[PDB]
Design a protein around this ligand. Structure first.
Ligand SMILES: O=c1[nH]nc(-c2cc(Br)c(O)cc2O)n1-c1ccccc1F
Length: 209
């Protein structure tokens, strides 16, 4: 069973702004997704400090970057706290209506799209480079769910029958045809070194055969 939801009008407007605005500095999407993974890893670590059983679903706290040139996908995997179905539906765990309002006021006053993370809606920067995004997630308190959207005002949620993850989130970016530089090892290494140098978890860039 696949459930289709409409985005809140303000989030659909955020997504169209990201897709339509001429903005060359698209590489910041990766910093934003790694930042969200770091935050999710911090959340499960914090819960584990008082309840070690929180890590029964996996003790390793890490981030993997998996490019696949055949599928034209870049996957960002983390073993953080994950998201429940309600978190996915509620804008992937954000207060995105108020974040979008603040971001749009900042843009009108001179900010630029790279500042999106300061408004707590950095996930949507994925649409600078992806035509479709799939988010697979597993939280200790819920089942494994797949969220997906190609923008256009809607998203889907379903229970995922695919490869079980113990706990965490996988963001699969189905890249736009002209954004394949983000599958190149040297380009990803450059972006991680430039923008993600103070992330306190191992970031492993996988290589391809
Ligand atoms: O909580 C939680 N869990 N999980 C999650 C996620 C998401 C996303 Br979109 C991404 O990319 C990743 C991840 O990991 N989370 C969150 C949300 C928001 C913000 C922050 C944070 F951490």
């Amino acid at each position: 069973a696949v459930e289709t939801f409409a985005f809140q009008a303000e989030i659909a407007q955020l997504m169209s702004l990201i897709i339509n605005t001429f903005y060359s500095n698209k590489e910041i999407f990766l910093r934003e997704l790694i930042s969200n993974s770091s935050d999710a890893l911090d959340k499960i670590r914090y819960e584990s400090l008082t309840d070690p059983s929180k890590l029964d679903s996996g003790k390793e706290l890490h981030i993997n970057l998996i490019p696949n040139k055949q599928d034209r996908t870049l996957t960002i995997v983390d073993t953080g706290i994950g998201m429940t179905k309600a978190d996915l539906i509620n804008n992937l765990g954000t207060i995105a209506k108020s974040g979008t309002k603040a971001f749009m006021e900042a843009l009108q006053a001179g900010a630029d799209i790279s500042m999106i993370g300061q408004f707590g809606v950095g996930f949507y920067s994925a649409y600078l480079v992806a035509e479709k995004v799939t988010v697979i997630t597993k939280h200790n308190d819920d089942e494994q769910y797949a969220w997906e959207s190609s923008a256009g005002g809607s998203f889907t949620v379903r229970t995922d029958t695919g490869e079980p993850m113990g706990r965490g989130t996988k963001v699969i970016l189905h890249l736009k045809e002209d954004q394949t530089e983000y599958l190149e090892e040297r380009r990803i290494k450059e972006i991680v070194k430039k923008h993600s140098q103070f992330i306190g978890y191992p970031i492993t860039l996988f290589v391809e055969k």
